[PDB]
Amino acid sequence: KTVIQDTADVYFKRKSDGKLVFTAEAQTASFSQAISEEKLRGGIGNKPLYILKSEKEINLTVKNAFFDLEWLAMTQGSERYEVEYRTIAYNPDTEEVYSDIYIQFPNVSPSGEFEMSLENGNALAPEIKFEALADTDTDEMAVVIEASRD
């Protein structure tokens, strides 16, 4: 009858400068990696000599009520939105905080459904959905930093 719960931490940041938008927590935090492929290409040209058809899409989700008070007001009155996750992991044998986990995305795009008009007064909770976006150059999306040097 005793249940142990954990937390996380989320940090947005727009590119070309260091404007910081962040959430204190990520309750839902539904990280969803998926892979799906279908039949493709005509098959002509004899050898295909290539098997790298890949469709990797990454979806995120955050929960908060903190939209930052410094520039939200100034804009109130398309340069990427790169995110940096941060969390902690512990060694099961010792149950001590020894590792810090950093997850980084260099390019994201906010895609929220503007149809959350509910019927009763809710607990705010403006859930925000994000999608990993990639250019055509190289690398991008998944980068993970691992602590626990000792």
Partner: protein, 707 residues
Amino acid sequence: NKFITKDDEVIDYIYGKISPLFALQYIRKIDLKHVFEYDYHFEVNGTVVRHKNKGFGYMERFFELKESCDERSKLSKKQYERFNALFNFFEKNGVICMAKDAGTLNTSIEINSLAYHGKYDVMKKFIEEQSVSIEDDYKKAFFLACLGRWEESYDLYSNIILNSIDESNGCVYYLSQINRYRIYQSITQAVTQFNGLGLLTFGRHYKPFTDEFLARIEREMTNFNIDDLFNGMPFEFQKKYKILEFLSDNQFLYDDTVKLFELTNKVRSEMSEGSYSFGMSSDIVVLLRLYDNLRFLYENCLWSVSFHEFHQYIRNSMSLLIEKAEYERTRDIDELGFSFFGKKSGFFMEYYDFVNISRHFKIDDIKNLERSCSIDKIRFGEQEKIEEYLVGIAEEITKQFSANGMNVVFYTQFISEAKAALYFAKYVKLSEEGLGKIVKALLFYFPERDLDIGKRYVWLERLTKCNELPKSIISIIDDFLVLQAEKHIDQNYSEVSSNGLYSRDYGALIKHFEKNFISKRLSEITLCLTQDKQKQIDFLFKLLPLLSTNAKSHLLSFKSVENINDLMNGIRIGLIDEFTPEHEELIIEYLETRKVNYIVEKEKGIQTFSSNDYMSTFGIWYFLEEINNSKMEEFIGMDDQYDFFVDPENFDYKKFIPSWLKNYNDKLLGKIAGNKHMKHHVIEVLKERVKNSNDKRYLEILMNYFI
């Protein structure tokens, strides 16, 4: 109710108890028990049984008068008129006869609201006409609410609420007040969500409402408490229209949700046992209840139809029904399984079902249904009306986004329906003109914020699944590519995507369906371009097969290959047949740089990922014989798949991910199954995964190839 003994007294009692209910177009059947003080019970089928009656069966008397033509003539002319009005009301409502004599019944479902059918132009024309009565004003208020003009909707509702008491109408005052409250709630949530996240979403601070309107709406109804609206207002309404009590509080979407939860539990329990159900199944009740609810909330001009709670209800009911249909498609019987109910409706998805799925679903839930059920096997009907609906969506989008006019309020409501419709139109056989219009609307005028260059390719390809590619669609995609080429002059454009594909895949898709597609306009664009402006070099080289022979020679003199992206793309287009040692040297250089930055990373200890692992493709090059160099082996230990492919002898199978096999081609899986070094472990891991999971692709791969 203890003095009901005469036939004419019976008719007078029923008229006195039903007469107030001629103002509404339609009423829910199962709520008639509230009117008669819980005396009877109207089953969703249409029959009746006795529940709390200890005297004369007046409903039974009316029912037996209905089937007796002679007794219908034994009444006064006034009584004949009352009986005729009762008959028309009972036929429109849907009740047919008694339960103890009920044979085969065929209940009818029909929706007449113009808001449901998505006829926006006719609705605008009706709105611009001059009003006649107060009910007309109610209709125009509803239509204005659905059109995204929430500013004037409040004004019209205020006018009718001010003029309501003059005509001594009761229903209009109650309904207008409720609609006022919902429209206020929606305006407040819209502006709050705007200021919250639309600044990041749309890129600007959109203010479509003036501040004084917000001040007034805040002032008028600061202390509005909705639960007291029924109780605090005069008694004649409290005694006549007791059926309309539930519209005030929120329980009107709680009772139905709980009943659907119970029925879903029952259906799920019956699915896992193999039981055979006679009579009215537990899934027909869901369909009937949903259709009655839709008729009530759409015929009578209510604004509770644009909310999240009702969408959840429709989503769950439809998902349960489709699950039941898929289960009933495939099962085992000994002898008498087909004997009981020796036919099936097959869940023929009609026009109303398609509208329901389009309006109240998102992409994620449709994807969940695709994963679980097999929608392709389900039959489709009236392919003509659905074509009209889709063409109407396309024309609305083209009209809205072609001119400078954009209504953000309408944009919040229309785009989800447009996306759902264009996604789900994959399974329905389309015409020629409709296909052309839909393709044009998708390709040109659909906003790039809600649909990047990635998902457009998915949606077009899925619309080509059940159809062909006639000349018109090829020409219009060529027009899209030419517009892209004219656009490919910006010095910063990058063509970002969330799928990994770009304009080259559109051309590849065309060339798959029709090969002899020497392009015409792109050839002129390539010819007129010189060596100074080299931003278009990438876009042109990605799209090499769509060019002329003179254009081929010009690009042969143009362009260059120095880094590994050019090599990989030339492999993607089939230009490169083999490798001279120069490309091998380049690959070796990249691998060497990988080792040095790898030892640096190991010194600091990050790991990484980097996603598009070109070294997995390099291991594929090595295994599949196309590259037979021996220096490749010096880089063992980079990735798990790299060791799995390059040196299977010294590779531990703990580090094998079962999800790699999703991305394996026919020939590659055949080659890997043809080997003997790593085969047995591959079968063992695939069997372990198939045994305890529900991925059909895993079973298919295990069966077809390795066995």
